[PDB]
Amino acid sequence: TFGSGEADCGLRPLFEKKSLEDKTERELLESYIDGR
Amino acid sequence: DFEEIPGEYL
Amino acid sequence: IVEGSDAEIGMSPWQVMLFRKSPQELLCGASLISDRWVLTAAHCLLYPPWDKNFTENDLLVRIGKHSRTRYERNIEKISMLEKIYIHPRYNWRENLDRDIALMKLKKPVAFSDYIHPVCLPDRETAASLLQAGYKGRVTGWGNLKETGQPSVLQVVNLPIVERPVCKDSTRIRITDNMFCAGYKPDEGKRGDACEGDSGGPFVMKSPFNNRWYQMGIVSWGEGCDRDGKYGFYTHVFRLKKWIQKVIDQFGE
Ligand SMILES: CC1=C[C@@H](C(=O)NC[C@H]2CC[C@H](C(=N)N)CC2)n2c(=O)n(CC(c3ccccc3)c3ccccc3)c(=O)n2C1
Ligand code: NA
């Protein structure tokens, strides 16, 4: 909702939930100087 | 330009 | 979105189409932060200067959408706004400071492969993330060129720009509730949000819990994809307090 949203907030059924990556996610991760 | 919506919506 | 790419299916599940019933046309972008609450730009709803004043009646909400034009038959769900809440100190008269609004659906929306909400940030998310250079992502069904229209929902990843640049790029008075985004011309990389992009989200994926958060709300700018020009976004974090206020006041 709020406080870092809802709960299942921001986990996409179609990527995250099945551990599939979209074609440009990397881009971003590589900017927060490369992810987790 | 928009395709028609289910009237149930209006 | 100017010089962007087509969305992938299920890539942006929180995305919403602000749809005007009559005539039948998209009015903006927007986002599902919950199964009963949508976050847009206050200017998608009120703009006296332009004789804009959407009442709940004038609107329907479309979620699950990928294709702009077509009714997405078994994929999307269409909602009716129950209530609208404009940011009390939203400044339409000047610089669109606090461009933020909430819309509470007449009934709970159902989560799915195509419909699932974005996180709203905490103080520490925002800290680690909204740092110049860090990339975020914008989506819309808006203009493809300052001066076509997409067939499919559009995507574009843009670097957060250092405050000073924001400022020396315009004549408009920027506030702390604002952040700007894009490439510098040095940078030779393109992409802007554009007309009909308002209300959509500027999201970044946390690299800590690798959750997707809405950093921004597409607000304003000058032209679309103009050199030495940036897109300005409402600062969600900055308004989060306003945000639990109304949700825990009359909400889901
Ligand atoms: C309701 C409106 C919302 C919004 C909009 O087009 N929003 C939709 C688009 C705008 C362009 C975008 C972009 N290139 N990223 C992103 C989303 N906005 C503007 O940006 N201007 C233009 C703008 C402007 C005018 C003079 C100098 C620089 C920029 C502006 C901004 C704040 C206050 C007034 C006018 C304006 O007149 N309005 C009125
Ligand atoms: Na540019």
DSSP C165-184: HHHHH-SS---TTEEEE---
CATH 2.40.10.10 in chain C is located at 1-12+118-237, 13-117+238-251
Kindly report the CA angle at C207 between C206 and C212, in degrees rounded to 5?
A: 30
Q: Which CATH architecture has domain C1-12+118-237?
A: Beta Barrel (2.40)
CATH number (1.10.630.10, 2.40.10.10, 1.10.565.10, 3.30.470.10) of C13-117+238-251 reads 2.40.10.10
The answer to whether C30 touches C167, Cβ cutoff 8 Å, is no
Interface of C with B (CB under 8 A): 21-22, 24-26, 60, 69-71, 78, 80, 149
Judging by DSSP bridges, how do beta strands C231-235 and C212-220 pair with one another? antiparallel
CA of A7 to the centre of ligand 1 (A): 34
Which residues of chain C form beta strands (DSSP E)?
Answer: 5-6, 16-20, 25-28, 31-32, 37-40, 46-47, 52-53, 59-63, 77-86, 101-105, 135-140, 154-159, 178-181, 201-205, 212-220, 231-235
Domains: count for chain A = 1
Closest CA to C216 of C181, C174, C173, C169: C181
Contact by Cβ (8 Å): C226, C240:
no
CATH number of the domain bearing residue A24? 4.10.140.10
Per-residue DSSP letter, C77:
E
CA dihedral C44, C218, C200, C183 (to 10 degrees): 150
What token pair was written down for A28?
């971003």
Residue C119 and residue C211 in contact, taking contact as beta carbons nearer than 8 Å? yes
Task: Look up the domain containing A9 and give its range.
Answer: 1-36
* Cα distance between residue C231 and residue C235, in whole Å: 13
Three-class secondary structure of residue C29 per DSSP: coil
Interatomic CA distance for residues C80 and C10, integer angstroms: 23
**For testing the chain A interface, which of C212, C213, C214, C252 should be mutated: the one with the most A CBs within 10 Å?**
C212
What length is written for chain B?
A: 10
Gyration radius of chain A over CA positions: 12
Cα–Cα distance, C136 to C35 (Å, whole number): 24
* Contact between A4 and C211 using a beta-carbon 8 Å cutoff: yes
C40 Cβ closer than 6 Å to some ligand 1 atom: no
Chain A residues with CB-CB distance to C203 below 8 A? 10
The CA distance from C185 to C143, in Å, is 21
Which residues on C lie below 8 Å from B6 (Cβ)?
71, 78
Q: Quick one: resolution in A?
A: 2.1
Take residue C41 and report the two structure tokens written for it. Answer: 């730009």
Experimental technique: X-ray
Judging by beta carbons within 10 Å of its beta carbon (0-12, 13-18, 19+), is residue C241 exposed, middle or buried? Answer: exposed
